[PDB]
UniProtKB/TrEMBL annotation:
<dbReference type="Pfam" id="PF00072">
    <property type="entry name" value="Response_reg"/>
</dbReference>
<dbReference type="InterPro" id="IPR050595">
    <property type="entry name" value="Bact_response_regulator"/>
</dbReference>
<dbReference type="InterPro" id="IPR011006">
    <property type="entry name" value="CheY-like_superfamily"/>
</dbReference>
<protein>
    <submittedName>
        <fullName>Sensory transduction regulatory protein</fullName>
    </submittedName>
</protein>
<dbReference type="InterPro" id="IPR001789">
    <property type="entry name" value="Sig_transdc_resp-reg_receiver"/>
</dbReference>
<dbReference type="GO" id="GO:0000160">
    <property type="term" value="P:phosphorelay signal transduction system"/>
</dbReference>
<keyword id="KW-0597">Phosphoprotein</keyword>
Amino acid sequence: MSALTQILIVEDEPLIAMMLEDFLEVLDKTPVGTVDTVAGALARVEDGGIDAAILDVNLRGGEKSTPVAEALAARDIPFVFATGGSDDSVDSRFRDRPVLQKPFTMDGVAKALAALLV
């Protein structure tokens, strides 16, 4: 198998969550789990065995959520952010890193997954 197939997703919108699960399966990867709270994201990242993960700027209740992506930097795990028509308030501390936003094509997610190496 490839060096990158186990991927976690973190979203609070139904569409962006199911679209990311579909794109991993067609890339022969594996959506190993999905969560909508940061305590669930900290519980999933601690399980280990994950190759990369995706994270929205805010979860349910609109509360800020970066305790995991700071942990992905400590675990040297690659990461992508997620934004929207009003969730694009991503911190400049991660604007040097890839971010998915509005609905995307097969090439749009491949662009972010390539930035995990670039």
